[PDB]
C-alpha cells in the first residue's frame, strides 16, 4: 500500500489518482489529509521510526533539511525530466541531485474583490488609503486589508522588495553566514508594515484563517493569498481579481518569494520502488499533471502542460506576481528562520520593540540556531 501526506488542496485528485494507479498496476494508493503547516514537523518525527509516509507533498523549501537528514530519497533521471521546468527542478535540487518531482509553482499576489474595489491601486500608498476609504465606508463589516501579517512567507513581498534578502547569493552558493533580513532594505519593509499597522489598515491579530474566510464570506476588499486558494472563492462566488502587490514606490516593485510545490519520497520507506514507479512514470505524464492543475490551479510545473492554460487570467496575473520574486532558498538553514521572523513581526505589530531591534534579535537568533545545528536531526 503506497501512502501519501498531503494538504486539504491536493486531497481530492490525489486520491482520484490513486484509484487510477490501482487500476493499471494493482497497488492501493492512500492518501491522508495532514494540515500544511505539520507535513514536515509530522514527518520529521514520524519518518526515523518507520512510520512516515512514502510520498509527501509540499514546498520545496524544505529539501535541504530533509535530505542532509537522510529523510528523502534522490530521484533519478527519467524521460519525462526534459519536460519540467529548469526553476522547478532546480528549486528541488539539492547538492547537484533532485529530490523531488515537482507539480507546480506560486507565488503570492493581491487578489481583490471587485465588489468593493473598481481598479487596483497604483501604489502601497493608493492601496492604504483606498483600504480606509472601504474601512469607513461599510462601517467596519468589510475589511479593506487583510493579511497572515507576522507570517514571514507573507511578509517578505515588503521586507525583500526593499532589499532585505535571507542568505548572500555567492558563486560558492548561498552564504548561511550573510544574513540580510536587519539590513537598511529589511528595515524599511518592516516600517512599512509596522505603518500599515498603525494607520490601522492592519491589526495585530491578523491571520491567515480570518483572512480567508472573511474573503470567501465577501466581506474582505483585498488580501495577499496564493494560487491554492482561488478555486475556494470562485467556488464562494466571488467576483475576485488578481494583480501583483502594487509597488512599493513609483518604479519599485514588492519581491514575493517563489514556491515550488512537490512530490518527495520517504528513504526510509520499504515502497520506494513502487513510489518511484508512481512518481516517475505516473504523476509526472503531461494528462496527469493537466488532471492536478484543474484540481489545484497553481502554476504548472510542466511546459506543455502550463501551455494549455497560459491563458487563463490568473495564471497571466500569478506569473507577473513571481517574475518580480525571489525563490525561497531550501538549504538546511532556512529551518530555523520562518520561526525567527514570525517571532519578530508578531514584537514588531505589537509594539514590544523596534523594527531594526527585532530585526537585528532575528538575523542572531537565526544565526545562533545555525551555530548550534538546529537544522540536525539524529537517530
Ligand atoms: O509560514 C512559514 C512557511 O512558509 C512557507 O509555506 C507557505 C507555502 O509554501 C505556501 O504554498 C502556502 O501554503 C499553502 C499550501 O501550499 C496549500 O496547499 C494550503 O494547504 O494552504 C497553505 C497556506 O495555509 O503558504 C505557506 C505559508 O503559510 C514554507 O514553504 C514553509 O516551509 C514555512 O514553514
Known amino acids: 500500500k503506497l501512502t501519501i501526506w498531503c494538504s486539504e488542496k ?17 497497488i492501493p494508493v492512500e492518501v491522508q489529509y495532514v494540515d500544511f503547516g505539520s507535513i514536515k514537523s509530522k514527518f520529521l518525527t514520524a519518518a526515523p521510526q518507520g512510520q512516515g509516509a512514502d510520498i509527501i507533498v509540499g514546498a520545496h523549501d524544505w529539501v535541504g533539511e530533509l535530505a542532509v537528514n537522510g529523510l528523502i530519497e534522490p530521484i533519478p533521471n527519467f524521460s519525462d525530466l526534459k519536460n519540467f521546468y529548469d526553476t522547478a527542478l532546480k528549486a528541488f535540487s539539492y547538492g547537484g541531485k533532485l529530490y523531488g518531482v515537482p507539480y507546480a509553482m506560486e507565488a503570492v499576489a493581491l487578489i481583490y474583490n471587485k465588489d468593493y474595489v473598481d481598479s487596483v491601486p497604483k501604489t502601497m500608498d493608493e492601496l492604504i488609503e483606498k483600504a480606509k476609504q472601504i474601512d469607513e465606508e461599510y462601517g467596519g463589516e468589510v475589511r479593506g486589508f487583510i493579511y497572515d501579517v507576522a507570517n514571514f512567507y507573507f511578509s517578505a513581498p515588503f521586507i525583500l522588495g526593499y532589499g532585505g534578502y535571507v542568505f548572500k547569493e555567492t558563486p560558492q552558493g548561498l552564504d548561511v553566514t550573510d544574513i540580510g533580513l536587519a539590513n537598511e532594505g529589511a528595515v524599511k519593509g518592516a516600517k512599512l508594515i509596522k505603518r500599515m499597522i498603525d494607520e490601522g489598515v492592519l491589526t495585530p491579530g ?7 474566510s472573511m474573503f470567501k464570506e ?25 494583480a501583483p502587490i502594487p509597488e512599493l514606490e513609483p518604479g519599485v516593485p514588492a519581491k514575493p518569494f517563489v514556491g515550488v510545490q512537490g512530490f518527495m519520497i520517504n528513504a526510509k520507506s520499504p515502497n520506494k520502488v513502487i ?6 512514470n505516473f504523476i509526472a505524464r503531461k494528462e496527469t499533471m493537466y488532471k492536478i492543475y484543474l484540481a489545484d490551479p497553481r ?25 518580480m520574486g525571489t525563490p525561497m532558498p531550501n538549504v538546511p538553514e532556512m529551518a530555523p528562520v ?8 508578531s514584537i514588531i505589530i505589537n509594539g514590544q520593540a523596534s523594527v531594526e531591534d527585532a530585526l537585528k534579535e532575528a538575523v542572531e537568533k537565526i544565526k545562533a540556531q545555525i551555530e548550534k545545528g538546529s537544522h540536525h536531526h539524529h537517530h
Open 10 to 26: 491536493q486531497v481530492d485528485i490525489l486520491q482520484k489518482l490513486g484509484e487510477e494507479f490501482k487500476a493499471k498496476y494493482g
Open 206 to 212: 491578523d491571520n491567515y484563517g480570518t483572512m480567508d
Open 218 to 242: 465577501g466581506l474582505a476588499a483585498m488580501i495577499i493569498n496564493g494560487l491554492w486558494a482561488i478555486k475556494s472563492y470562485k467556488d464562494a462566488g466571488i467576483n475576485y481579481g488578481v
Open 275 to 280: 513510489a518511484m514507479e508512481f512518481l516517475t
Open 299 to 323: 502554476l504548472p510545473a510542466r511546459k506543455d502542460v502550463l501551455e494549455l492554460v497560459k491563458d487563463n487570467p490568473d495564471v497571466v496575473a500569478f506569473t507577473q506576481s513571481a517574475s
Open 338 to 345: 520562518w520561526s525567527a521572523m514570525g517571532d519578530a513581526l
